[PDB]
Amino acid sequence: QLLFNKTKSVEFTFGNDTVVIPCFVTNMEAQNTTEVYVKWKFKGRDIYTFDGALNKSTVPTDFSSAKIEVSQLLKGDASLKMDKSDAVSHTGNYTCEVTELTREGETIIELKYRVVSWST
Amino acid sequence: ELQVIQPDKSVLVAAGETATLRCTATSLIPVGPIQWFRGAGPGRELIYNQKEGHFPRVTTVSDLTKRNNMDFSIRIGNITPADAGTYYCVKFRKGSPDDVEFKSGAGTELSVRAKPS
Ligand SMILES: *[C@@H]1O[C@H](CO)[C@@H](O)[C@H](O)[C@H]1NC(C)=O
Ligand SMILES: *[C@@H]1O[C@H](CO)[C@@H](O)[C@H](O)[C@H]1NC(C)=O
Ligand SMILES: *[C@@H]1O[C@H](CO)[C@@H](O)[C@H](O)[C@H]1NC(C)=O
Ligand SMILES: *[C@@H]1O[C@H](CO)[C@@H](O)[C@H](O)[C@H]1NC(C)=O
């Protein structure tokens, strides 16, 4: 399998304009992005996919801001980036699934909203 | 072209012992996983994949964390008659909302026999 540097959860507040969901493969050994496939699942639904063979990123229109920095894939970084409107409407557990040729693996991260104090 | 080879058509195992289900891929392309199932069709049972899942009785013959690994053989410990059936080593291509079966091995019939005493 592909092995991960696991984070149980990440928190964001009213203050985050954008949010990052970490995903880090520790034994990534890919030479090219054509060898890689990425799936980000939110409550079992695919909300971001990257098909390396077609260099194609796909997101449903309710998750329009969802993206990964494709250049970081060879480093094992498949972290998901989204804007606050998508984060606030999709809090909960995410699964990050990565495939490199025939090796595969996944990890779960909870995106948690934290209510804090603000000055008008 | 890819071949998923199950060299054993059958395996006979004494109850309580370990079954070895052999599988080798001739290639690691197209991108996609190899999984083991019991049975074929709609009601086939997932027996193993590389993800963290619930396959406690399963160990792999080789080190599947290796990029160049082509051996997908598994071992199932403490065999009982309940484990009997035909096992398939199956290759998928990646897809959303579902990965698509690409190639399957020919199957290995696991049969079980009583152990003395
Ligand atoms: C996860 O893994 C790397 C080690 O490979 C570690 O150095 C890094 O701090 C970790 N990532 C994060 C964002 O904590
Ligand atoms: C939200 O913003 C803080 C900094 O203000 C940052 O440390 C944190 O990683 C952000 N949360 C997420 C989930 O991106
Ligand atoms: C990846 O391989 C494709 C051909 O399969 C090639 O077009 C592309 O430029 C390669 N990229 C790198 C960074 O090697
Ligand atoms: C997220 O999943 C973990 C188990 O991996 C569970 O403990 C947690 O309660 C889940 N959170 C939600 C809000 O579903």
Author numbering:
A (entry chain B): 1 to 120
B (entry chain A): 3 to 119
Give the exact sentences the study uses for this entry.
CD47 is a widely distributed membrane protein that interacts with signal-regulatory protein α (SIRPα), an inhibitory receptor on myeloid cells that gives a “don't-eat-me” signal. The amino-terminal ligand binding domain of SIRPα is highly polymorphic in contrast to the single Ig-like domain of CD47. Manipulation of the interaction is of considerable interest in the immunotherapy of cancer and in xenotransplantation.
The two most common alleles of SIRPα (v1 and v2) are also the most divergent in sequence with 13 residues differing in the NH2-terminal ligand binding domain (total length 120 residues). To determine the structural consequences of the sequence differences, the structure of the NH2-terminal domain of SIRPαv1 was determined in complex with its ligand CD47 to a resolution of 1.92 Å. The interaction interfaces of SIRPαv1 and SIRPαv2 with CD47 are almost identical with only minor differences in the DE and FG loops. In the DE loop of SIRPα, v1 has a Leu at position 66, whereas v2 has Ser, both of which interact with the NH2-terminal pyroglutamic acid of CD47. Ser-66 (v2) forms main chain and side chain hydrogen bonds with the pyroglutamic acid lactam ring, whereas in v1 only the main chain hydrogen bond is possible. Although the FG loop of v1 is longer than v2 due to the insertion of an Asp (Asp-100), v1 mediates the same interactions with CD47 as seen in the structures for v2 in complex with CD47. However, the SIRPαv1 main chain oxygen atom of Pro-99 can form water-mediated hydrogen bonds with Asp-46 and Lys-39 of CD47. The variants differ mostly in surface residues on the common Ig-like domain and distal from the binding site, so from a protein structural point of view, the suggestion that these have different affinities is unexpected. However, the values we determined for the affinities of the other SIRPα variants for CD47 are not significantly different from that determined for v1 (Tukey's multiple comparisons test) and are close to previously determined values. The polymorphisms in human SIRPα lead to changes in surface-exposed amino acids, but we show this does not affect binding to CD47, which shows no comparable polymorphisms.
